[PDB]
C-alpha cells in the first residue's frame, strides 16, 4: 500500500576544506518507486507527502552535534528539520544518538540531503545506529 | 487519503505568575479538514487514530528541559507524551532538540497543546528547530 524506503550507511564522506560530513546510503527495505538513493543523496521521482526520519549516532566530544535534512530543487533550498545534540567532554561518556522526523511535501525532481555540520565528524556506520527512512502518506 | 498537518512557531507565550511556556502555531502543510490550528492550540475535528509528533529546541542551562503534549476534552485531560532533555551547565554547549512522538486516538472536540514546564523557557522559533505535526491513520 504505502511506498516506503529504509536506508543505512555504507560509507561516510567529508570533502577537505569543508565543515560538512555526509553519508553514503544503501537501501535495506524498499517498496514502491518514488524515491531512489543515489550515493550521498536521495532523489525524489513521485511527488507527494512523505514522512521523513533521520537518526545519527555520534562520538565526538565537541560542544554540539546533530544533522540537517534538506530538500534542494528548482534552484531552491529548504531546510526541513534539524536534530541537535550536546555532546559531553568525556570520550567514554560522549555517545548520543540524534533522532528527528516530520511530514513534508516533496516534488518530483527534488533532492534530499543529510548533512552533519562538521568536518571529519565521528559517527557510526552501524545500520541500527545511524539510518534514514521514508514513508509516502 | 490521510488528513495531515505540520505546524511551525509564529510566536511564544508564557503568562506571568505561572511556570509554563506554550507555543503559538501556524500551519505550513495541510491536507484534509480533520484538524485546525487555533493560536496556541490545535483543535481536532475528526475522531480517529493520529500519529502525533513534536520537537522543541532549547537553550536554557537549567537542569532538565522538555515538553508535555496533551489532549483536553469534555472537562477532561490526558498527557499523551513527554520529552525530557538534560541541559549542560556551560551556556555555549547548552543546546538540545527534544523529539518525541506517538499514535493516539484523538476525539472530535479535543484541544491539543504543547507546554514547556518552565516560565519563560528559552526555545527556538525556527521552523526547522521547533515543530508539531499530525497524520491520520
Amino acid at each position: 500500500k504505502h511506498s516506503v524506503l529504509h536506508l543505512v550507511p555504507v560509507n561516510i564522506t567529508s570533502k577537505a576544506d569543508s565543515d560538512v560530513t555526509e553519508v553514503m546510503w544503501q537501501p535495506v527495505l524498499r517498496r514502491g518507486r518514488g524515491l531512489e538513493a543515489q550515493g550521498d543523496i536521495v532523489r525524489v521521482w513521485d511527488t507527494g507527502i512523505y514522512l521523513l526520519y533521520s537518526q545519527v549516532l555520534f562520538h565526538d566530544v565537541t560542544f554540539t552535534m546533530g544533522q540537517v535534512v534538506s530538500r534542494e530543487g528548482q534552484g531552491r533550498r529548504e531546510t526541513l528539520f534539524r536534530c541537535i545534540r550536546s555532546m559531553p567532554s568525556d570520550p567514554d561518556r560522549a555517545y548520543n544518538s540524534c533522532y528527528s522526523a516530520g511530514v513534508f511535501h516533496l516534488h518530483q525532481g527534488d533532492i534530499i540531503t543529510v548533512k552533519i555540520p562538521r568536518a571529519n565528524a565521528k559517527l557510526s556506520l552501524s545500520p541500527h545506529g545511524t539510518f534514514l527512512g521514508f514513508v509516502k502518506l | 487519503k490521510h488528513s495531515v498537518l505540520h505546524l511551525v512557531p509564529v510566536n511564544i507565550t508564557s503568562k506571568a505568575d505561572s511556570d509554563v511556556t506554550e507555543v503559538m502555531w501556524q500551519p505550513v502543510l495541510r491536507r484534509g479538514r480533520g484538524l485546525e490550528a487555533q493560536g496556541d492550540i490545535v483543535r481536532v475535528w475528526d475522531t480517529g487514530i493520529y500519529l502525533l509528533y513534536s520537537q522543541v529546541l532549547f537553550h536554557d542551562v537549567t537542569f532538565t528541559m522538555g515538553q508535555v503534549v496533551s489532549r483536553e476534552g469534555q472537562g477532561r485531560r490526558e498527557t499523551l507524551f513527554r520529552c525530557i532533555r538534560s541541559m549542560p551547565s556551560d551556556p555555549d554547549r547548552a543546546y538540545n532538540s527534544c523529539y518525541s512522538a506517538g499514535v493516539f486516538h484523538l476525539h472530535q472536540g479535543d484541544i491539543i497543546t504543547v507546554k514547556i514546564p518552565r516560565a519563560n523557557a528559552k526555545l527556538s522559533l525556527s521552523p526547522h528547530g521547533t515543530f508539531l505535526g499530525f497524520v491520520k491513520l
Binding site: 565543515d19 554540539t64 546533530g66 540537517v68 534538506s70 533550498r77 531546510t79 534539524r82 541537535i84 555540520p117 562538521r118 | 529546541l57 537553550h59 543546546y95 527556538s124 522559533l125 525556527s126 526547522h128 528547530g129
Partner: peptide, 16 residues
C-alpha cells in the same frame, strides 16, 4: 558555529 551556516541558519544558536 557550524549551525550558523546561512543555508540552515538559526539565530537561536549564533552566539550572544
Amino acid at each position: 558555529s557550524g549551525w550558523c551556516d546561512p543555508r540552515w541558519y538559526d539565530p537561536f544558536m549564533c552566539e550572544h
